[model samples]
Target: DEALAKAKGCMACHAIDKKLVGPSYKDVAKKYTEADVPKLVEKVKKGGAGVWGPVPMPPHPQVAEADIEKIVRWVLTLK
Candidate 1:
């Protein structure tokens, strides 16, 4: 399947290989583990700040749980 990240607009704030407003996918994958998958998924949905930078991660209430989990797992693949 095509990478869910690209279609989901995650790339708007994050680039897989390079940094943008958000950290790179590679950096995030390196920083976290599979165990953090579920946690990260919700963090993206609910949205919060103080983790990456002052720029708060916006919520994705539009994305379903399944899609987010798929994206989370895919990002972790870089680890």
Candidate 2:
């Protein structure tokens, strides 16, 4: 999971516990749920903001759907 995140440049603005440009993975897990996976996946692919704060999460359209799902799934497990 760490390898995939690093390869995708997610580490630049996100961390396991610390907040960077985006919210922490553990914070995300706490704020959302398994039922939100589909929505989260889309948000990740297309980018989103306002929920966490003013800082926007940029679109990662270059990433594959499978990889996005994997990343989202792993993120949801951070808690």
Candidate 3:
């Protein structure tokens, strides 16, 4: 999973702990509730800026809904 995320460019700035160019998955999970997961998934698919800071997580046109679900689930587990 780590390898895939890294290959997909997620690891360029994200980590399990500590801040990078973007918020860690753990930090995202900490701030957002379970109910908010779907909303976030959509955000990832569509793309947006200013949600975390000046840096923006671009839209993932190639990412499927299922992968988003898995990613979100894994991220929440970081807690």
Candidate 4:
């Protein structure tokens, strides 16, 4: 399941640790909690800027909220 979601380009510029093109997934996980996950998911779904950096993460409207939760949970596990 991790590989499936990751392979779908979820990990393209994001990682568990260390900054790539974007902030680390672990950093995001550590910075946010389950309660904030929905807000983050919504951002990912709709796409936004000025949060992580200037490079905007494209809108992932096709990605399911459940899948986003799963990804966020997994990212939280990375550290």
Candidate 5:
């Protein structure tokens, strides 16, 4: 599912261990745990800002919902 992120253009402004336009996936994993998946999935799909910083995370309706869930799952366990 890591490759799935690259395929979805998520890697453009996001990186695995470092902050790009958004926080690192590692940083996110620290803040959110598995129980946050429902809200997390919606955030990825609809997109939002102010969570990470002034630079917003763009909406990703182009990505599959299941794929969003897959991506979400990956981000929750880096720690």
Candidate 6:
């Protein structure tokens, strides 16, 4: 999971516990559930602001859909 995140450049803004430019993976895990995967996947692809804070999550449209799903699934496990 860490490797994937690193490869995808997610580690630049997020960590397992500490907040950076974005919220932590564990924080995300705490807020969401299995049913939220699809929505989260879309969010990762398109990105938005005000969900975590004023700092926006930049769109990652270059990431493949399958990779986004894998990353989201992995994030949910951090809890």
Per-prediction tally of clashes: 0, 0, 0, 0, 0, 0
What TM-score fits each model? 0.91, 0.93, 0.82, 0.82, 0.93, 0.95
Alpha-carbon lDDT, every model:
0.86, 0.89, 0.78, 0.76, 0.87, 0.91
For residues 1-79, what per-residue lDDT tens digits would candidate 2 score against the true structure? 7789889999999999998889899999998888899999999899978997887889988999899888888899887
Root-mean-square deviation (CA) per prediction? 1.3, 0.9, 1.7, 1.7, 0.9, 0.8
Could you tell which candidate, 3 or 5, scores higher by lDDT? 5
Stronger candidate by lDDT (4 vs 5): 5
The lowest-lDDT stretch of 10 consecutive residues in candidate 2 is 48-57
Q: Which segments of model 1 are wrong by more than 4 Å?
A: none
In angstroms, the error of model 2 at 22 is 0.3
Residue 64 in model 3: lDDT: 76
lDDT of 6 at 37: 99
- The CA lDDT at 24 in model 3 is 88
Deviating ranges (above 4 Å) for candidate 2: none
- lDDT preference between candidates 2 and 3, better one: 2
Residue 59, candidate 4: Cα error in Å is 0.2
Candidates, ranked, lDDT: 6, 2, 5, 1, 3, 4
Off by over 4 Å in 4: none
What is the C-alpha local distance difference test score of candidate 1? 0.86
lDDT, candidate 5, 14-68, per-residue tens: 7889988888899999998899999999999999888767777878867889999
For model 3, state the Cα shift of residue 64 in Å: 1.3
TM-score of 6: 0.95
Looking at model 1, how many pairs of residues clash? 0
